[PDB]
């Protein structure tokens, strides 16, 4: 069943989530990605002459996802994966 996933996630919460979230934030912040996303947002708001959240998000999210550096991406994935091999059976 797929209740398993939610269960595992609950365990993840009770235990380390902060360390991951914080390291991610620090990495994205330090490499300038956050401010790039701010500039992108101001630019899109100015181009579309709109503050409507849904339409701006619709254009912002994919690109913002692409803008994540490979280093940060693979490092954070690597770390989560490191944390996962602890508490699952194969």
């Amino acid at each position: 069943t797929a209740q398993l996933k939610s269960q595992i996630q609950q365990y993840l919460v009770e235990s380390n989530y902060e360390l991951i979230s914080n390291e991610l934030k620090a990495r994205l912040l330090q490499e300038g990605w956050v401010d790039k996303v701010k500039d992108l947002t101001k630019s899109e708001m100015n181009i579309n002459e709109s503050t409507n959240f849904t339409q701006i998000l619709s254009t912002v999210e994919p690109k913002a996802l692409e803008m994540v550096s490979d280093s940060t991406r693979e490092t954070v994935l690597k770390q989560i994966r490191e944390f996962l091999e602890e508490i699952v059976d194969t």
């Binding site: 797929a2 939610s6 996630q9 609950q10 912040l29 330090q30 300038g32 401010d35 409507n52 959240f53």
Partner: protein, 451 residues
């Protein structure tokens, strides 16, 4: 012609429904300000349907107890199935209408809902900031040699702790003298008034600055703006005077001062003294600090300067006998951070002394980061490693000229991430990259993330 959500207008057409809503918003925000991280994860970031944590944003229902995820459209499902069109984003407390497909960010009542009970009065007595003044942006003309002062003042003018203090009316509420020609803080509040509001009811917005200058003349004419002086010295002098005014406004074993300066700017250095033989020890001395002064020679980066600053030194002129190895020794000294301040102020020592008794300016570019990690500088380990400790750059003072003569300019960053240059009367837009190419003298960093 931007519209407003008609659904909340509809709810607000009824006073008791409105009150229920505002009560719930206020309660929710209080909870958000008073809930530990794990409880928050489990009870506000857990999807009521799939039970996943952080399945995108999780929304807490305005009308019931259900929490719903974005990725599986589960709040969307709560809205479709029960008819509850309003939900609160658990990351920011903001209220979403699922009919407009947009957040409600432009209703003043909602943003300040805690004052809802008194809202009518709030609307009768007070107005929103004027466009011109809303960011408090205005230049301060050179009234003689005042560049060393105003450059310092703009970073203060854009400091959230200071603006919170001043706009809170704390001095005004508590001042026993209540005259800006005597009290520095009353004058400051007047400045804030002039820059963000309107005096009742071209020469504009200079009154507070003139009061401050008059006070300065009264305490120390030399530092009052007629002559050229040192901005760091002015910083320590003025914060000490502000502190003195805090102590003055008090009605009353407490070594540490409890003033605004000492709850924002005060940290402590740990100085360890260790035997080079035993390497165990140590003799620890704790020193308060309000700022840090860094050597810059033969370096190109701020981190290099902090490394040098934090670097161990062997004293060759200190008389020292170790009791653990039972011998005369040259002690090892090291500075590290015992306590960090909320706001970190840095001075780069851009000068050197020559054998002929003259001084020379150091114009060397020193690279400084937009974000600063202090983890390598903390003295005390946990049961070890020290965690990440990151500050955000919010202010720069730069100098052009020589050691004995020159000019100060300020750079400040505001909301949205944009930078402005403050050159006396002139406030201008500037890009971040150029600010980062500037020759920095003073740097202002606000605490941003502590792991």
């Amino acid at each position: 012609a931007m519209s407003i959500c008609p659904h909340i207008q509809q709810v607000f057409q009824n006073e008791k429904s409105k009150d229920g809503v505002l009560k719930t918003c206020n309660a929710a925000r209080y909870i958000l300000n008073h809930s530990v991280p794990k409880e928050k994860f489990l009870n506000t970031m857990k999807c009521g349907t799939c039970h996943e944590i952080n399945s995108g944003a999780t929304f807490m229902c305005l009308q019931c107890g259900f929490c719903g995820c974005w990725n599986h459209s589960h709040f969307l499902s709560h809205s479709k199935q029960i008819g509850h069109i309003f939900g609160i984003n658990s990351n920011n407390g903001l209220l979403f209408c699922f009919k407009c497909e947009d957040y409600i960010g432009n209703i003043d009542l909602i943003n300040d809902a805690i004052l809802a009970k008194y809202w009518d009065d709030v609307c009768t007595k007070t107005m929103v900031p004027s466009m011109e003044r809303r960011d408090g942006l205005s230049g301060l003309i050179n009234m003689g040699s005042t560049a060393f002062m105003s450059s310092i003042l703009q970073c203060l003018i854009h400091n959230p702790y200071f603006i919170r203090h001043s706009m809170s009316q704390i001095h005004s509420n508590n001042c026993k003298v209540r005259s800006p020609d005597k009290c520095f803080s009353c004058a400051l509040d007047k400045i804030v008034h002039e820059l963000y509001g309107a005096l009742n009811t071209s020469t504009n917005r200079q009154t507070g600055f003139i009061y401050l200058l008059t006070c300065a003349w009264k305490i120390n004419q030399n530092l009052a703006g007629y002559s050229q002086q040192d901005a760091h010295e002015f910083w320590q002098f003025i914060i000490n005077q502000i502190h003195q005014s805090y102590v003055l406004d008090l009605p009353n074993n407490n070594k540490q001062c409890e003033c605004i300066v000492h709850t924002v700017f005060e940290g402590s250095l740990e100085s360890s003294i260790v035997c080079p033989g035993c390497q165990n020890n140590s003799k620890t001395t704790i020193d308060p600090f309000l700022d840090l002064s860094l050597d810059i020679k033969d370096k190109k980066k701020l981190y290099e300067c902090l490394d040098s600053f934090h670097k161990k030194e062997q004293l060759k002129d200190f008389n020292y006998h170790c009791g653990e190895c039972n011998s005369t020794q040259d002690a090892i000294k090291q500075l590290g951070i015992h306590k960090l301040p909320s706001v970190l102020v840095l001075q780069l020592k851009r000068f050197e002394h020559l054998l002929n008794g003259s001084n020379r300016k150091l114009d060397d570019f020193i690279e400084f980061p937009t974000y600063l990690n202090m983890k390598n500088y903390c003295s005390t380990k946990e049961k070890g490693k020290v965690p990440d400790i990151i500050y955000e750059l919010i202010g720069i003072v730069s100098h052009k000229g020589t050691v004995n003569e020159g000019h100060y300019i300020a750079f400040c960053k505001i909301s949205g991430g944009q930078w402005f240059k403050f050159n006396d009367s002139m406030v201008s837009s500037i890009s971040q990259e150029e600010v980062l190419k500037e020759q920095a003298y003073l740097l202002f960093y606000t605490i941003r993330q502590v792991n």
